[PDB]
Amino acid sequence: SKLEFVPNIQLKEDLGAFSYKVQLSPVEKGMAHILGNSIRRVLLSSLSGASIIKVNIANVLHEYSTLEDVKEDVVEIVSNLKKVAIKLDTGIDRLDLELSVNKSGVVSAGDFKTTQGVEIINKDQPIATLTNQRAFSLTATVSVGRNVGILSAIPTELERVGDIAVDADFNPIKRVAFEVFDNGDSETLEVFVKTNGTIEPLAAVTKALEYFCEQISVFVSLRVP
Amino acid sequence: NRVLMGANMQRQAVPTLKSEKPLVGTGMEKIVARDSGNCIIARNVGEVAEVDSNRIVIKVDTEKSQTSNLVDIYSLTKFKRSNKNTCINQRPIVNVGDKVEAGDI
Amino acid sequence: LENLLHPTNIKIDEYAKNATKFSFEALERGVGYTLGFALKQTMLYSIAGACVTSIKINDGKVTSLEDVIPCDETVADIILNVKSLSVTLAEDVETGTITFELSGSEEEIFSEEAKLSEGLAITEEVFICSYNGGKKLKIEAKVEKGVGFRPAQDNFKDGEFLLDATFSPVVFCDFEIKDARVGRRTDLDKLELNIKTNGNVNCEEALRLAATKIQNQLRNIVDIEEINKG
Amino acid sequence: ILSPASGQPIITPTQDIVLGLYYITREKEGARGEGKLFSSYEDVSRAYNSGTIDIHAKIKLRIDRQVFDTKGNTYNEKGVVNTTVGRALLLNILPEG
Amino acid sequence: DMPYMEDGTPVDVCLNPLGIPSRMNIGQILEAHLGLASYGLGKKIEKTLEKTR
Amino acid sequence: EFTCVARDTKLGPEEITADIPNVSESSLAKLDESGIVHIGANVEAGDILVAKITPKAEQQLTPEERLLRAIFNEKASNVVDSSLRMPSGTSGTVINVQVFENDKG
Amino acid sequence: KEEDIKSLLKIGGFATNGQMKLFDGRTGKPFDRHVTVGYMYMLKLDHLVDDK
């Protein structure tokens, strides 16, 4: 036949907020819907990320607490430390961020001390509001992991006295779709990915395919390892 | 027969961590939340002087209001136990500098 | 994060002759449903082979499925009997033909008859007909090669009975998902594959053949040649 | 399995098991794949899983099975019947008898 | 595993449709229609907010 | 909301001192120098929330304890432990503690 | 009314029924028969299984 197509990955159409369109141009006329489904189902379930897993505010003992001059309660601050999109580097795997101010306005996500390796993606994410001038300090802990599901999870052991546990959403992908187009003797797979910002579309989709191939590679031998 | 039990079942609804309006409503959720004493209501025309999650201090505009104290202080309920073991909690809406009226939440 | 999970427990079981049940257990949650769909759809519709695609009987004189032919079977039994032959075409031929012209005195007909073209290798000896020795009976079927499932837009055009083209050889897959655990995690999967070929290949070599065909579409994107190493 | 007040069964499918079985066994007159000729349940399955044939299309199927009758004897059911794609997809669960 | 719309949006809940005509509470269906309407009206605004705010 | 009371029983007054007899020393960590938990600790099912002690005498254990109590030389307890514990299954964090002490004393 | 829900559904860019095409999350092929999707407001009653 000599009609062996092997698809190549591309990044047509960078659109929207954090929305893109990956594309796999030469596909072998039947194998495209399989790849669309496997990509959509592995992106939305197996990708790893980083998030805040524990916080320690200074003059605060528990979560059902309150600070002076601050317009929020700790239950509402720990709720904003969940929308902070962080981007770790290669082999850190764990670290403690630090925040400390003495201003009199909206504290933001941009106010974390500049650690190397960390990078906050959404910088105008409100964290707290100080209505009068005062000193506001907290230490968030960042970790890597994936959404392993509700029951099985990590209990997030606490060490100091004011430690509060935050439950993280590690996956960076928010919404996937796909489509398949006809070319004649080949087809075009077209993926739509929407991320939070801490990963790029090509790297994401090739990580998905790496996972899927490592899964498929057990049926080529019918052997355990 | 079903309205009977749809009315009876929204008196058993546990309130949630973060509240959220109905997108389809009747125009009566405001009346039921106001004609109970859970929302804080301003008694005088003023403008917010200080705010946190424990109190609110209004600065009464005395030219259009009565001979009031020149200052209204409203204190806020925070993590209070309910008859059903649930949680009652008040959160401020206003910002320092806002022009409020009589009746406003 | 924490090192995605692999099966480690495979169980094969040949219940019928060309039919087998596989079991792979301790797949991470929701993965059995993406492996099963992929394997099923690539095994049933993206393997290559040969198949009978057209049948014309009395050089085109038999038109309806309700025409009398000199044998015990009807026209429909003949068409369904021939259609289920597992022919196989040689490495450089595009088409074939199997003619069955038979007359004489009341025998029982197998595929031991049927002069084959250059390349065709019918490969088994299925029953065809019971001839009633009367008039002459002409039967010739057209053979082809390809990939997929080419449906037939018409059932009988002008001279031949147009059939559906399959080419796959694998007849039935049917995966199914069950529960498992590796200790405290209790939401994992167990996949059950139920493959059934037509003889031209065994099931353990249609699995191995759909798997690598899936992997080979991911070579300009992934480095599979070391991914395999374990 | 049966009621003690009557003889009627108590494990009869009820609400949305009845709707699925009712849906696939109806039939549409001019449908896509109408009149084809299959020889098995594996055939109708494989042809249906490809998206090329309807589930309400009239087909012809070849059966060959044993059927016990009232006296207890066991005759042989053979031939080519006029069916629907959906009914013939249920032929896999029927037991012998 | 949830059904999803064409653009990828998953679904929140699935509710059997059989219960509706036997217990004749149709406002439950008109509410879902008027909720689709308002969800669409509110994405018509989020579209404009990300372009020339 | 759980409650523990310090009675004035006949055979001996009930005191809320932390000196719980024969209680495991590890379980003596989450309690302050008084015998009450700290506001903000994470308590589990089966932990002490308040430590109250009342007296108890006249043990008179059976001969089974008399044949195996001479290998450790158990001490005598003039006091008992009416110390509040958390119920079963429950957990959470303490957010408030209130004390009302002896009237007119 | 219903004329009004239809007018608003048009302005939102939907069909004048609550019905749209959905996709099987497990394979990716659609269902036949457009499904009714919408935004019902749902409650959670004090009948939790933890205390039962």
Could you please describe the fold and organization of this structure?
Chain A has helices spanning about 30-45, 75, 200-215, and strands at about 10, 20-25, 50-55, 95, 100, 105-110, 125-130, 135-140, 140-145, 165, 175-180, 185-195. By secondary structure, chain A is α+β, with helices and mostly antiparallel strands. Chain A folds into two domains: about 1-50 and about 170-225, no CATH class; about 50-170, no CATH class. In chain A, the strands form four sheets. In chain A, strands 1-2-12-11 form a four-stranded antiparallel beta sheet, with helices on one face. A four-stranded antiparallel beta sheet of chain A has the order 4-9-3-10, with no helix packed on it. Chain A has a two-stranded antiparallel ribbon with strand order 5-8. Chain B is of the alpha+beta class. Chain B is about 10% helix and about 20% strand. Chain C has two domains: about 1-50 and about 170-230, no CATH class; about 50-165, no CATH class. Chain C is built from four helices and ten strands; from the N terminus they run E-E-H-E-H-E-E-E-E-E-E-E-H-H. Chain C is elongated. The two termini of chain C are about 20 Å apart. In chain C, about 40% of the residues are buried. Chain E: Belongs to the RNA polymerase beta chain family.
Keywords:
part of a larger assembly, 7 chains, A: alpha+beta, 2 domains, 4-stranded antiparallel β-sheet, 26% strand, elongated, D: 97 residues, alpha+beta, 3 helices, 21% helix, flat, DNA-directed RNA polymerase subunit beta (chain G), nucleotidyltransferase (chain A), DNA-directed RNA polymerase subunit alpha 1 (chain A)
Brief account:
The PDB classes it as transcription. Keywords: RNA polymerase complex, transcription. Chain B is of the alpha+beta class.
